[PDB]
Amino acid sequence: LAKRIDAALIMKDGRVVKGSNFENLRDSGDPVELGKFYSEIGIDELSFWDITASVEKRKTMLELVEKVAEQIDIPFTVGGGIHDFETASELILRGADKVEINTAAVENPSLITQIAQTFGSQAVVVYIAAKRVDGEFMVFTYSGKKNTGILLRDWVVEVEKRGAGEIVLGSIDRLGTKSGYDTEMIRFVRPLTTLPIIAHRGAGKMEHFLEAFLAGADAAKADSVFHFREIDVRELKEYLKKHGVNVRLE
Numbered sequence: 001l002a003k004r005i006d007a008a009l010i011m012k013d014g015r016v017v018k019g020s021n022f023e024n025l026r027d028s029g030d031p032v033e034l035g036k037f038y039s040e041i042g043i044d045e046l047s048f049w050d051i052t053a054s055v056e057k058r059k060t061m062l063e064l065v066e067k068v069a070e071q072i073d074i075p076f077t078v079g080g081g082i083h084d085f086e087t088a089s090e091l092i093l094r095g096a097d098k099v100e101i102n103t104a105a106v107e108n109p110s111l112i113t114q115i116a117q118t119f120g121s122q123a124v125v126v127y128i129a130a131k132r133v134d135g136e137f138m139v140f141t142y143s144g145k146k147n148t149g150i151l152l153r154d155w156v157v158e159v160e161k162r163g164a165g166e167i168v169l170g171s172i173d174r175l176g177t178k179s180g181y182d183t184e185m186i187r188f189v190r191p192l193t194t195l196p197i198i199a200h201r202g203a204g205k206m207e208h209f210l211e212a213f214l215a216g217a218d219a220a221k222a223d224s225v226f227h228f229r230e231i232d233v234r235e236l237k238e239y240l241k242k243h244g245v246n247v248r249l250e
């Protein structure tokens with residue numbers, strides 16, 4: 001299948017954290033209008049990540065999903081502290097196509113299966129944050145704060161076994177960098193799973209997307225490179241097509 005380009009939007013109290021540089025937008029920090037604009041210029045799927053610190057979070061995420069579903073016609077994922085089946089269920093029913101889970105899945109891997117039982121494997125995305133520690137790829141939880149001691153190799157196999165649809169592979173070793181995706185990490189994971197692998201962290205220029213796809217990624221996700229317009233989405237897709245990558249053009 002076609003390689004996929006995803007945009008992730010980090011949100012807090014209903015706003016896109018640090019906004020965007022699209023002057024054409026009425027409100028460049030509105031996640032709905034920004035998401036809609038991305039869907040029009042060639043983003044394939046959207047990810048909405050909420051960090052509303054406690055209290056209003058549940059209602060905020062549900063209202064976000066409802067507003068997004070009304071306006072956009074490409075698939076989207078919602079994530080950020082989804083801890084149980086009922087939370088995931090209400091977000092999917094309100095409009096999300098998929099839910100994206102990390103810490104709660106590591107702590108209770110049956111959560112993957114429970115969501116998939118009702119909504120299908122295709123509705124369950126597991127985000128795996130990994131980092132090199134003493135020469136092994138280790139799985140990290142709590143926004144990179146906790147080394148679980150679980151090997152990346154073991155967790156990838158378990159995630160597929162439990163019934164996840166896709167894996168987002170986030171390299172903590174590339175957080176905040178613009179040097180490229182962690183292609184070594186992608187190549188390490190590729191033979192271990194039949195699931196779609198979505199690369200995250202490290203993108204800085206168009207050539208990094210090509211590199212990630214050569215490494216075996218099925219999709220590439222980014223955020224600030226798009227929001228601050230370091231990479232244009234249409235230019236990226238034209239570049240990838242030029243060099244033989246199967247991507248969807250309009």
Ligand SMILES: *C1=NO[C@@]2(*)=C1(*)(*)C(*)(*)(*)=[C@](*)(N(=O)=O)[C]=[C]2
Pocket residue numbers: 010048049050051079080081101102103127129142143144
């Ligand atoms: C995934 N792994 O750690 C995370 C993940 C997502 C979000 N988020 O804001 O959706 C936060 C931490």
